[PDB]
Amino acid sequence: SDLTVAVVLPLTNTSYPWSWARVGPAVELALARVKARPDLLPGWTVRMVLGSSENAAGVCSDTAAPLAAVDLKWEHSPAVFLGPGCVYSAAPVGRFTAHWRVPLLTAGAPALGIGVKDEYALTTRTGPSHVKLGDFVTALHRRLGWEHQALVLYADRLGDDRPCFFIVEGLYMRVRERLNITVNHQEFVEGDPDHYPKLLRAVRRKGRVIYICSSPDAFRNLMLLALNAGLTGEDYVFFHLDVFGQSLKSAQGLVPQKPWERGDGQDRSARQAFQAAKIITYKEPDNPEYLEFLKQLKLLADKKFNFTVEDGLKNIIPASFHDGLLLYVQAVTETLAQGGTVTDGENITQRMWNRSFQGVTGYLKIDRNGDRDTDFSLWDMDPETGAFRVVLNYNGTSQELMAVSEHKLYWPLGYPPPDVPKCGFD
Amino acid sequence: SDLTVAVVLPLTNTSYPWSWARVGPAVELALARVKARPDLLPGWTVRMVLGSSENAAGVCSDTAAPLAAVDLKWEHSPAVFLGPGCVYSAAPVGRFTAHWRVPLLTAGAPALGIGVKDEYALTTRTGPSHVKLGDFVTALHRRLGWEHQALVLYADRLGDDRPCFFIVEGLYMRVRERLNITVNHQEFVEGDPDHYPKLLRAVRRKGRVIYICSSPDAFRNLMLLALNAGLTGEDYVFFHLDVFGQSLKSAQGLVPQKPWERGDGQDRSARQAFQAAKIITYKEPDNPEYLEFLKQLKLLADKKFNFTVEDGLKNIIPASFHDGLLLYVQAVTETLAQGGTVTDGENITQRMWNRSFQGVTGYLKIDRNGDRDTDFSLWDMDPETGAFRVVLNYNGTSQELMAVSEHKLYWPLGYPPPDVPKCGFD
């Protein structure tokens, strides 16, 4: 008569895209629409029991989260888990829920290893995955002739969820799985100056198509050092893997978009350097339903959660929890319509997988593996104004690259430079 | 009035050095001696509750084990946890017990990160640690003039507990922490022939003091390929990191000790090749108490556990659980003698730490970090007979290298070859 939904996310820390201050009201909106839909679980009263994935310091934990999962499992016996979004939180919890035969929904946990559904059984991801980033990079390399060598630089703060490592891991594995080109990689520490000589050296020795996963400032500093060292768009191209677009403002206002602008009297040199820089991000959903969702999300989050949801790409995560939860309810409704129960995790999960759905994020497709296809945007600066804008869009389901607003990919030489230099790298 | 000891180990798989078929009777021997000792917990009746660390396939698990820990914790509220021994089992469980403020004892979990007691609080290791291997290698390099460069080759079976990775991790980190010499490393797959050209190439390009963590057969094959390629003891020295001495028989009988003998008509070539090979292992405890312990262990294990405990270096692990359990009981006895309780994990742990103890394994020392100092032996072949024997012994506590039975380290050139070649590696 009622459905018990267990939640393991950061209930206090509001810094994560998947924080409860931001996923809570999104999920609240979803349950609210379930009530209004006579075609989604009629009569059922879906309840939620919460558990915090953060430890005593307030960051998501590889210990707090599994402990909270056990706690909710024996206290309430839920039919489905929601979250976590951190990789080190989700991995033990995922293995627990897979052992318990309980479905798991999260719009986080984008790491490669979560994709092993033979281990993470009944785990359905409705947000981005890092292999999908590899898919975008594969398509990019196929459409520009780069079929030899690329260099990947990535950095992480010590003690975090290692986001840039998992990003690069997914890109590395997938791209090498599909193209078998040499992908060189190098980790660095952002605050350590000893690595910048090393990195610049590696840049001009290991690749010409270069991907950097780092902070905005690290990528700016690297660009500034690359220009200072005579590395221009005629030979090098630097892709910043800024999937949440931290280096950009929101797509609602703040016209125009200048990631090289900092106000430190270096902005003139940074613009000239960023001529060789392009930014890869997730795609902002275009559909109006998304905009209406943000309006309601902001309203509810300020209302029953005392939080201010700001505009930005991070909001696709709570939108995907919302869409993911609705995708689940219909699956449960369809299972009940054929004599199943809410505990047939396999039947429910298979109903969600290999399926196209319409939610606030627009068209979303769950692949045969239980992971949402992820769309990406490619930003590029206009050589006239210097501001960055989307010039290329990647549909994750069709794997097609489509030009945006009749824009062209800016190249100082007219065409992309080769991924291998003239007479070798020497 | 009674002490509840929770145990999380492989209760069915008898393949691990820390299997219950091997640690069970060792621990039962320990409790049996606690009774006979009026100076250890008088009147208390120590009980044991068991949980298996292995999953449905029967290998130690990163899921079964933490689940079994929670299960025992809420069902019995123990005062101490025993095990697990696998690294991936012990890491989540250690973090659980650390959060619960419950002491943890294991003679396994040798991995580097378990040593971060700021995280794995109240975890006391009474068996070997892989940093302690770094300590032995450090003392070796200081005593033979190798202060520049060494190469480390390691391999693992896909899906295991990555033993050779954690061995190398501990060696790598500790040796670099103390000598700051270049330690190159390379992972390979044993079953993959494509790596043997690569490895031999790396051997003659990356180092001359070479450590290999692998199976006996992989190390034999590499030696045979190294001889076939003209790599002799005059320039190269190959250390096999065989801490449990799998490539050797037991120290009780089976005289003599020939790891190059295989019966495949390659034995004549393997002996000539193994002249450049030395084997690093844990040290067999000399004290008579150890031999009496093995006698009783074999008798009990065959009696109440239907298992046949065979002679070999692996038996130090259940001996160390036995000694660690006695170490704990005295700590608890001392805590109770000063008005504490059995739940003062901090007081009990600090009593065990930075302490010398006398057990079946002889003198054992818990360092300031809560990890047992580990003694190592260096095996070398006699150029007359070809059989291998201990020629060098490392006391982990005093960090001293002592010659064994007036033997000398065999060198084809009379002295060890330099860790750097003549006019560089080119």
């Binding site: 590889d62 990789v87 080190y88 991995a91 790491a111 490669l112 290893g113 979560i114 290692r162 490592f165 690069v168 891991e169 590395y172 594995m173 060189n184 990689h185 190098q186 980790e187 660095f188 520490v189 350590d192 000893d194 690595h195 090393k198 | 990163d62 690294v87 991936y88 890491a91 989540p92 991995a111 580097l112 990160g113 378990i114 971060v116 990555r162 990775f165 190398v168 991790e169 790598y172 980190m173 490393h185 390379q186 992972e187």
Partner: peptide
């Protein structure tokens, strides 16, 4: 891989050792 694909526990990320890192 030598560096990527090896489980998701912080115990296997204490040194890298398969990876190309400056730290």
């Amino acid at each position: 891989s030598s560096c990527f694909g090896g489980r998701m526990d912080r115990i296997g990320a204490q040194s890298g050792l398969g990876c190309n890192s400056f730290r």
